[PDB]
Homo-oligomer: A and B are copies of this chain.
Amino acid sequence: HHMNESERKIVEEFQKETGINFKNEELLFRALCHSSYANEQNQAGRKDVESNEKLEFLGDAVLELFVCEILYKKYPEAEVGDLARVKSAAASEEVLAMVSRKMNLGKFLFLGKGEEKTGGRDRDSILADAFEALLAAIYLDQGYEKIKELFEQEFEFYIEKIMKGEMLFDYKTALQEIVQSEHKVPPEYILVRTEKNDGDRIFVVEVRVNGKTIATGKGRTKKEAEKEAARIAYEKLL
């Protein structure tokens, strides 16, 4: 398949924006191609444009192994019934769409005009599916180690939340909504210090409202600590 100008631009923007470069850019294009766009282009005579359905099929297996490996290695004392519970929760459409949105994945999808007109770019199923297809593309292009490099830290965090029975969602967005509603101002995040416990560098962030510290969260990155802080503040405020 020969990428036309607008397709090449999108493919270039995706790599620049997400930082995920590809050796074979055709794998990336394919992962982002919803069937509605492949059908549209094929009907326009571009028979080599293909959907992400096959990559999604492989991607789901890549994801399952990636999540189960984290569970097996990180929770040796967990009952097998617990590994299975968490596995299902971690690989769910809900988590994947959340991950996709955080990556602004919707911006880079190729959709047929009708799908575009009817909200497909915001559809949880389409986003989750494209994310799985992306994992297969990265797996095929650069290997399983790259998948861990890009996503293990992020998923270890989601799996920890789920294993601990803590509800998982976009913490920062939820906290902002509740703080603006009750105080008419947004929450402020302050990195107050860093630590080096367990071997990893740890960021300590306090979330405050009107200068008052509501909660303190810790994480392996500034972003993660902010997320943790928002989770704690949200649960506390409620």
Q: Which residues of A contact B (CB under 8 A)?
A: 53-55, 57-58, 60-62, 64-65, 67-69, 71-72, 76, 80, 83-84, 136, 144
Contacts and interface: CB of A to CB of B under 8 A. Distances in A.
Given A58-B71, A61-B67, A61-B68, 8 more contacts: A55-B72, A57-B68, A61-B61, A62-B65, A64-B64, A64-B65, A72-B136, A144-B144
Contacts of A68: 57-58, 60-61
A112 B99 CA distance: 45
B57 A61 contact: no
Nearest to A84: B57
User: Which secondary structure characterizes the binding site on chain A?
Assistant: helix
Contacts of A60: 68
Given A72-B136, A144-B144, A61 B54 contact: no
List the 3 closest pairs (A to B, CB-CB), nearest first. A61-B68, A61-B65, A58-B72
B64 A61 contact: yes
Contacts of A61: 61, 64-65, 67-69
Contacts of A64: 61, 64-65
A77 to B, nearest CB: 10
A83 B61 CA distance: 12
B53 A58 contact: no
A84 B57 CA distance: 8
Given A72-B136, A144-B144, A83 B57 contact: yes
B54 A83 contact: yes
B80 A57 contact: yes
25 contacts: A53-B80, A54-B72, A54-B76, A54-B80, A55-B72, A57-B68, A57-B71, A57-B72, A57-B80, A57-B83, A57-B84, A58-B68, A58-B69, A58-B71, A58-B72, A61-B61, A61-B64, A61-B65, A61-B68, A61-B69, A62-B65, A64-B64, A64-B65, A72-B136, A144-B144
